[PDB]
Amino acid sequence: VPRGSEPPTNGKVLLKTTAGDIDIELWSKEAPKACRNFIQLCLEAYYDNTIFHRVVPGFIVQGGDPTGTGSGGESIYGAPFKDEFHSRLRFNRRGLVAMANAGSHDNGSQFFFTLGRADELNNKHTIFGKVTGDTVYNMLRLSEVDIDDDERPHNPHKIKSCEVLFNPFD
């Protein structure tokens, strides 16, 4: 049993992006609100044709804003929803999927992938999924971009489509 061993995932989403396919396994037991939100938005096409508008080298690449501006996007709930943390879901490696926010209990639609560690985000951002080992390279390629001074890529990568491969709420 490795240190930092994570609970089993349940739920799978496939993003078809301009950097390749990215396969996300979901922690639906530990972060049910975030997982339900992500699945439903995925199903409703809400993430289709959306950009990855923010890249911080070695830290995060962030997307999920239907406006592409960095400030838009809303949850399925009619208001931003609560954080969901778990002591076994930690920012101790690259390839995790977490919700963006601008404070406590402020989850909307924007989410990000971790490009490195981000321990300082532990207990601040909901971690709701992880990228499969065999799609991490494509996830990292989202960050392989020339960037402006507001962390915006000159030519952002995009999600063409999102599909739910296994829906744990069915």
Author numbering: 3 to 172
Reproduce text from the manuscript describing this model.
No binding was detected for PPIL2, PPIL6, or SDCCAG-10, making these, to our knowledge, the first set of human cyclophilins that have been found incompetent to ligate cyclosporin. We were also able to confirm that under the experimental conditions we tested there was no evidence of CsA binding to PPIL2, PPIL6, or SDCCAG-10. Three cyclophilins neither bound cyclosporin nor tetrapeptide: PPIL2, PPIL6, and SDCCAG-10. It is clear that these three proteins are quite divergent in the active site compared to PPIA. Perhaps more importantly they are, along with PPIL4, the only isoforms that substitute the residue Trp121 with a non-histidine residue. The molecular function of the PPIase domain for these isoforms is unknown, but our structures suggest that these isoforms could still serve as proline-binding domains. Indeed, our assays show binding to the standard substrate suc-AGPF-pNA even where we do not detect isomerase activity. There are three distinct classes of conformations adopted by this loop: the PPIA α1-β3 loop family, which includes PPIA, PPIB, PPIC, PPIE, and PPIF; a shorter version of the loop represented by the structures of PPIL1, PPIL2, PPIL3, PPIL4, SDCCAG-10, and PPWD1; and a longer version found in PPID, PPIG, PPIH, PPIL6, and NKTR. For PPIL2 and SDCCAG-10, both of which have been found associated with spliceosomal complexes, it may be that it is the non-active surface of the PPIase domain that performs the major function as in the cases of PPIH and PPIL1.
Cyclophilins are peptidyl-prolyl isomerases (PPIases: EC 5.2.1.8) and are characterized by their ability to catalyze the interconversion of cis and trans isomers of proline. In order to understand the molecular basis of these results, we sought structural coverage of the entire human cyclophilin enzymatic class. We determined crystal structures of seven human PPIase domains—PPIC, PPIE, PPIG, PPWD1, PPIL2, NKTR, and SDCCAG-10. All cyclophilins share a common fold architecture consisting of eight antiparallel β sheets and two α-helices that pack against the sheets. The active site of the cyclophilin family includes the invariant catalytic arginine (Arg55) and a highly conserved mixture of hydrophobic, aromatic, and polar residues including Phe60, Met61, Gln63, Ala101, Phe113, Trp121, Leu122, and His126.
